[PDB]
Each structure stands twice: as structure tokens, then as C-alpha cells.
Amino acid sequence: SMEQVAMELRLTELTRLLRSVLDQLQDKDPARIFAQPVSLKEVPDYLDHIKHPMDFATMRKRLEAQGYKNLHEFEEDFDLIIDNCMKYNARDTVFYRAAVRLRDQGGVVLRQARREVDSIG
Ligand code: NA
Secondary structure (H helix, E strand, O other), X not given: OHHHHHHHHHHHHHXXXXXXXXXXXXXXXXXXXXXXXXXXXXXXXXXXHXXXXXXXXXXXXXXHOOOOOOHHHHHHHHHHXXXXXXXXXXXXXXXXXXXXXXXXXXXXXXXXXXXXXXXXX
């Protein structure tokens, strides 16, 4: 059907907006602390602490499969990256502090994305 292709035109265009948003969030992490999953060989207890790991490469694979049906789903994943990191690492660490900064800088980008997704549809 034609409707399915119009929805697909919108899921596709959402993906195009989310890709720009992802690239912009990932520029606020020049250290690349959040680029790839935490290594279970280097952190073998990780899953005893964090039940849903997330990272930017994993978000990108989902994005490129058109796996985000709305901005809420995308934001949930971004907040995992931040939230996992602030739980696992102590407050006085470079990692915990990188997450705070990412969150703060990410907020501005996400605020305007919520407007563009509402505005365009
Ligand atoms: Na903690």
C-alpha cells in the first residue's frame, strides 16, 4: 500500500533527523569514551552492575536499521549511555565527569530536535 510507503517516508525522514542528532551528540564526546560498548573482557563484572549497556555504535546500528520508531526511543538509549556511566563510575572519575558534560551539552541538541520532530511531524 501507498500509506505504508508514506509512513516509511516519515520513519525514513525521522532516521535522517536522528542521524544528524546522533552525529551532533557524538561530537560532544571527543574523548570517545562512549563510542563503543564497555568491554566484558576488560570489565568482566560489568553486567552484574549494568543491566542494559548502551553506546554510540550500538545506537548507530539500530538507527541505520530504522529501529527507532520515535524520538523518545532514541533519547531512552542516549540516557542509558549517560545513566549507566554515572552509576558504574564514581563521582570523582574522568568517566563520570565525561557523562555529565555529555548530558549537559546533549540537552541543547535534544531540546531543538524535539521541536523539529513536532514541527515537521
Ligand atoms: Na556509583
